[PDB]
Amino acid sequence: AMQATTTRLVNRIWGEFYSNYSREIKWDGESLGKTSAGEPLYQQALVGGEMVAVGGAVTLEVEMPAIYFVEYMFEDHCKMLHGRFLQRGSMTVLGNAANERELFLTNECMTTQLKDIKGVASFEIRSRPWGHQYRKKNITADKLDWARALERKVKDLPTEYYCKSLYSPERGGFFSLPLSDIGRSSGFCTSCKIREDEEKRSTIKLNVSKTGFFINGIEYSVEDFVYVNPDSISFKSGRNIGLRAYVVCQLLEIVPKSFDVKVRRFYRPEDVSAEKAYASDIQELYFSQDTVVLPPGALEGKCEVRKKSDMPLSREYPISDHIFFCDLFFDTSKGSLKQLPKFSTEIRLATLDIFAGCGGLSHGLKKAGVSDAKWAIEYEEPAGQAFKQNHPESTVFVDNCNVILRAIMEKGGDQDDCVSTTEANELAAKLTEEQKSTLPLPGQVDFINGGPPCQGFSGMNRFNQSSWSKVQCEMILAFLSFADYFRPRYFLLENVRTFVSFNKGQTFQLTLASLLEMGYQVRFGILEAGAYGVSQSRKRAFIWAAAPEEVLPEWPEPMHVFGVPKLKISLSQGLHYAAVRSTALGAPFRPITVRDTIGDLPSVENGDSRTNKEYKEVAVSWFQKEIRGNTIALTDHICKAMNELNLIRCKLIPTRPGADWHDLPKRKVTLDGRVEEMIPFCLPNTAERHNGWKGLYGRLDWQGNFPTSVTDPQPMGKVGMCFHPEQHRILTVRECARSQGFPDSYEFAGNINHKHRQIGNAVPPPLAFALGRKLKEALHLK
DNA sequence: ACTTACGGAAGG
DNA sequence: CCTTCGTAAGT
Ligand SMILES: Nc1ncnc2c1ncn2[C@@H]1O[C@H](CSCC[C@H](N)C(=O)O)[C@@H](O)[C@H]1O
Ligand SMILES: [Zn+2]
């Protein structure tokens, strides 16, 4: 319940949203060259007295006039000018959080006569050096710039605009300026060439040798292995049943018609039965002799099909390899599976994890090879204990982030740049010298990640205007202040999907506006955790930020079928951005089900409290072999104890898909001597406004998926689906951890409520691993 | 320390 | 027009 401790930059950005806020036209000079069409190229000109030059900006009438950064000028004797659009900040995803003097370069350009220019706008390109050591100089320069801008605005003088980033709504973010590709004055525009290449890579182009084509840039050819959409050849938490994956085919022939492709076919284990898909590798295929003639537009990508001997030695949980293996033959007519009677042949960053929790993000990030987890901050004792247990080489501060930040800023001597409450200062002054000597200092942290609390942004929160929820939503400012003070090379933020829509997006827009103020490149997206190898409907919003000299990571490619449409962020002007595709209509791998996740764990009764057990059966599914590994000790296979009435209700729920409280008979039970009603009073009382409370007192489906992991699985909770598919009990701690992708060797601390809170709060380790892989690729790109 | 009671907006 | 996805008050 502490007000966030912030630097003055973040405090100034958020303002009131912070609780603790404190006609003559003539060429100038000679020519310098000619275009490919023999047109002289000039660099300087005069248009009615005002001066136009390559690298400046010009104005066109449109309501505010449009601004165009001049790329080149040339001459019919008609004077011409090519310019790239400079979008204003208010017309971007920033909205009302943008400055009135900042312009963003876009990939849209136009050619216009010099007579159409309304005037010349004072325009500069801003490129400040990056580093924590330039913060004070940047602060002084920004104060001077603000004073000059206010002075000019008082006297009604023309505005002076600056540009430091390029706005990509198609890539969804703000990237670094290609300073070497703009203002060349050579008759060649990079955006024009990019547009031409994008237009070219869209049509059907049969190759010269009549053996392949160029669908969407991909160069398919005969004997290649391709993906085909399965359509071209429900209850709560069970919407993935009936969803099929990509049909893997071999390009056999190019049948002339403007042509068609004749392909063979491969069968997956799930095409035989659901029991065969359970006990089978996710990358297994069956040879068949069925050929289909398809249009060339039905192909969805390329893959490799090997034998079991030539499969890659490295095995990862989040599978990013488009490699399958074929060993058996599926007879379509008989339905049998027989044997086969042309297949295929340093950067670790010192990391600070704020709001660490039990270490779900840190585990995946450091498993990918990009994070060190050198420092962690987590103010809850059980979660900090779990983090220390799972990352023994990490320095964990079990303290408020607003106190750790105050201690860090006070250690560095920047007490005048800290906006903190008296309580934060008093608690920071009460830190022993041992902890104040191991605190991180700016220049030692190259990566800051972590997810601030989402309980104030979640749509479940009925009371999101209370003091507690308003304080929880204020932890964004402390995270941004950590990023501003330390200035790491990379920055990662995770929150709920509703974080981008909360308060009309004003919290989201004010976040990017902060990161852009520090001089970052910011990109945003929304990812579904169930498309990366878990049986869970978990939609999370991610924000990547990088220094101007670094490369922004790409988004991981989902490889599992999941019944979730495209998750779009609304930018502005009716535009939307989807970070990744939707795998509902096809993906390389089949969805993970509940039985694949928790099918092999031994049965336990209600209220089991044995924290140490032994595995009874061996792993069967592909998930169980990957989630257990070499673990021989079963930990935290314990479930919460239900009272007599709740246990009585649980035993009367049928063990069939779609079962919930609607199947409870209407009768009076006697427990003690108390007489109660079997059906809870609150469920039919407000069922009309809550979709009938579907899923409450509901069992999981063996072929479905787990619902969203909450910090307190209850029978009568907004989720509801917490009962075992076959056992009269709630899901154990270990089962809820497996549903989140946690390896069986992971440890949790506290009582059962603390462990459940730890699991329900954590980022799925597979998603963190995928993000870390993308970050590793970005780091190697530099 | 548990158990019950339960609003409304963003996307489709 | 369904389909998602935690905090307070009462024992
Ligand atoms: N002000 C604060 N200072 C430090 N930790 C905080 C905090 N406010 C909330 N937290 C912690 O942040 C955690 C949620 S973030 C979840 C942990 C992490 N994202 C993961 O993937 O595992 C909670 O457990 C809470 O204890
Ligand atoms: Zn151009």
Numbering used by the authors: 624 to 645, 708 to 747, 752 to 764, 767 to 924, 934 to 957, 966 to 1049, 1055 to 1058, 1090 to 1415, ...
What did the study's authors say about this model?
In plants, DNA methylation occurs in CG, CHG, and CHH contexts (where H = A, T, or C), with the maintenance of CG methylation mediated by the DNA methyltransferase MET1. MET1 possesses replication foci target sequence (RFTS) 1–2, acidic-linker, bromo adjacent homology (BAH) 1–2 and methyltransferase (MTase) domains, whereas DNMT1 possesses PCNA-binding, RFTS, CXXC, autoinhibitory linker, BAH1-2 and MTase domains. Of note, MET1 has two RFTS domains and lacks the CXXC domain. Arabidopsis thaliana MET1 exhibits a plant-specific structural feature in the autoinhibition state, and a conserved activation state compared to mammalian DNMT1.
Cryo-EM map of the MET1MTase bound to hemimethylated DNA complex was successfully reconstructed at 2.74 Å resolution, which enables us to generate the atomic model of the complex, except for the acidic-linker (aa: 646–707), loops and linkers in BAH1 (aa: 748–751), and BAH2 (aa: 925–933, 958–965, 1050–1054 and 1059–1089). Domain assembly of the BAH1, BAH2 and MTase domains of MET1 was similar to that of DNMT1, with root mean square deviation (RMSD) of 0.768 Å over 682 aligned Cα atoms, indicating the conserved rigid core structure. The MTase domain of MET1 consists of two moieties, catalytic core containing S-adenosyl homocysteine (SAH, a methyl donor cofactor product) binding site and target recognition domain (TRD: 1305–1477). Hemimethylated DNA was sandwiched by the catalytic core and TRD, in which TRD loop1 (aa:1426-1434) interacted with the backbone phosphates of the non-target strand of the DNA. In addition, the main chain carbonyl of Met1461 and side chain of Lys1463 in TRD loop2 (aa: 1458–1470) interacted with 5-methylcytosine (5mC) and the adjacent guanin in 5mCG of the non-target strand, respectively. The methyl group of 5mC in the non-target strand was tightly surrounded by Cys1427, Leu1428, Trp1438, Leu1441, Met1461 and Gly1462 of the TRD via van der Waals interactions. Flipped-out 5fC in the target strand was covalently bound to sulfhydryl group of Cys1198 of the catalytic loop in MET1 (aa: 1196–1210), and recognized by side chains of Glu1238, Arg1282 and Arg1284 of the catalytic core, in which side chain of Met1204 occupies the vacant space after base flipping of 5fC. The spatial positions of the 5fC and 5mC bases in the hemimethylated DNA were strictly restricted by the catalytic loop and TRD, respectively, which ensure the robust CG sequence methylation of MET160. In the N-terminal region of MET1, the Activating Helix (aa: 631–644) was adpted to a helix-turn conformation, which is similar to the conformation of the Activating Helix in the activation state of DNMT149.
